[PDB]
Amino acid sequence: EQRASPVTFIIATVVGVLLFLILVVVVGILIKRRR
């Protein structure tokens, strides 16, 4: 629990930031710019 809870939060943060830069920033904001 003491090391496993902050390591699980770092694993969830890196997959959430990777899904935001691909799905929201590239196929969303940058596809609205490239029209």
Rounded CA-CA distance 3/13 in Å is 16
Count of residues making up the chain: 35
> Experimentally, how was this structure solved?
NMR
Angstrom CA distances, 34 to 18, 21, 22, 29, stand at 21, 16, 15, 9
Angstrom CA distances, 23 to 3, 14, 18, 26, 29, stand at 31, 14, 9, 6, 9
Q: Per-domain residue ranges for the chain?
A: 1-35
CB atoms within 10 A of CB 11: 10
